[PDB]
Amino acid sequence: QVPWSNVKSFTYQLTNYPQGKLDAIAASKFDLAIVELVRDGSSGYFTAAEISALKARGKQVLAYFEIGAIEEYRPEWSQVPADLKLGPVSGWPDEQYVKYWDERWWPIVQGRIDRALAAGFNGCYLDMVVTYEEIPANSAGTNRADLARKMVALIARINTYAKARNPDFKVVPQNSPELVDDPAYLPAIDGLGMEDMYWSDDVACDEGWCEENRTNAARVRAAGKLVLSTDYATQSAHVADAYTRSRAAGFVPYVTVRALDRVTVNAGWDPQ
Template structure:
C-alpha cells in the first residue's frame, strides 16, 4: 500500500435518492459558536442533534489507520479511545490478509460504547497490491520492481490509465467503465479479470464492516472538463458510482444501515462541476446541480476531508492555509446533517489544539496524525 498525495490524487493510505429511503429533511446549520477543544485526543465538536444518521450521532472522535509496520494490527485499534475507525479491510492490502468477521466484530464491540468501523476502498485508482490487479498489466513487473516507473502493457484493460506520478503503484482508472465497476460493486460472474470472485464491496460487507470510506472521489477533476477533458460528465459519473455502491449494499445486500463516506471531492456538487452539455433541455444548470446534490447527499452519511485547514507541500506540519472554498462546501455537507471528518497531518501539540478548535467550531470531527497513517496517535 502507498500513501497518496493531496489534490487530484488525495492523501489516503496514511471517505436519484435511494429507492425506499425516507425523505431527507435538512437540519439547521451548525452552531459556529460551539467550540470543543480537546488537545490532541482526536475528539471534536460534532453536535449529535444535527446528524442525520442515528448510528453516527455519538461520533466525536476517530482513528484513521491503514497500515502498520510490517502490517496493520487490530489490538491498538481495539484499545483506542475512538468512536469511529477507518481501516483497510486487510492487514497488508492483499486479500490473503483480509480481516474476518470475528475480528471486525471484536473491533466493533471494543470500548465502553463500541465503535463504528469503516473500510477504506479506493474507487478512483487501481492499486497493484489488490486482489484484482494483474502484474502483467505493467512493465516492469511490480513484484520485481515495486517502485517502477511503470508503463502499461498491451495486456492492460481499457479502464486502466496512467500511473499516479507520485506513487506509480497506484494507477488512475476510468471509473465509469462497466468492467471496473463490476470489480468494485457487484460481480455477477464470468468477469474477464476476476472470473466468479466476489467484488471488492461484497468482501467488505461479508467481513462485517459498518460501511465504506471511498477514496479518490476527486478523480472527476482529472478526467473532467477542467482536467484532461476526456470525460465531460466526470462529476455525474462519479456521483452515479457512489450511488450505485450505496444501492448495492443497502438494497441488493439488504444492509439498510450501511454507511457510505466519500473522501475529498466536496466540490463535486458545485454548479461548475457539471458540463453545460449534460444539462437536460429545459433545465437550468443550477437546477440540475441542485438535483444531483440532493441525490448525492441522500446517498451518503458523511464525508472525510484532508488538508482543508493546513494545505501545503510538506508531509506534515504545514502552516495554516485554510481552503475557504472547500471549507464552505464542507459547511454545506454539515448543514445537511452529514458527519464531516476533518483530517490534518500534524504532529505539534499546539498546532493540533488550534486545529481541533477550528474544526470543532464548524461542527466537524477532527483527526490529526502523520501522513503515513500507520499508527494510533
C-alpha cells in the same frame, strides 16, 4: 456501539498494523475507526471476527477502499485491462487511475463492498474520488463536469447496492466535497471525510482552495452528514487549532501523521 449520530472522535490507520492485527485500534478510545479491508495492503482481508472485536469495544468501523484507481499490489489488478487504465497516479505505472464509470470497473467496486459487508463493517470510506479531477478532462470523450457527474453516479451506485444488503451500511467519500453541488450526491452519502482543511504537515491550509474545501464541507454538514476531518500536524498549537476550528464548524476532527501508520493520540484532544 456508539450510534452514528453521536460519533465524536475517530482514528484512521491504513497500514503497519502490528502483527497484522487490529488490537491497538480495538484498545483505543475513539468512537469510530477507519481501516483498510486488508491487513497487508493487498489481499489479506480482515475477518468478521476481527472486525467484531473492534465493534464490541463500541466503535463504528469504516472500510477504506479506493474507487478511482487500482494498484499492481492489489488483487484485482489482473482484472483491469489496459483499456480501463488512464495513467500513473504519481508517475509510477503500477498505480493507475481508472475509467471508474466503465461497467468493467463496477465488479471491482462491488467486490470491495461485498468484502466490507462480509467482514461486518459499519460502512465504507471511499478514496480516489478525486480521480474525477485528476484524469484528463477528455477521458470519457466528454469534459470535467461530465466526469464529476460520473463520479457522483458511482457513489450513488455504491450506496444503493450497499444499503440493499445492509440498510445500516454507511457511505463516506473522502475529499472532493465540491461534488456536493450535484443533487445526486447528498442522497447517496451518510458522511464525508476531509483531509487537510486546516494543517498539512504543520503548514496552514490558507489558500483559496482550502477555504472552498471548508465551505463545501459546511454544505455537507448542513445537510446532516457526519464530517470527519483529518489534519496532519504535531506542533501543539497547530493540533489545537485543527481540533478547535473543526469542532466549531460542526465537524469531527482527528489529527495524525500522513503515513496513517499508527493510532495517534493527542492528549487533551482525543478520548483517553
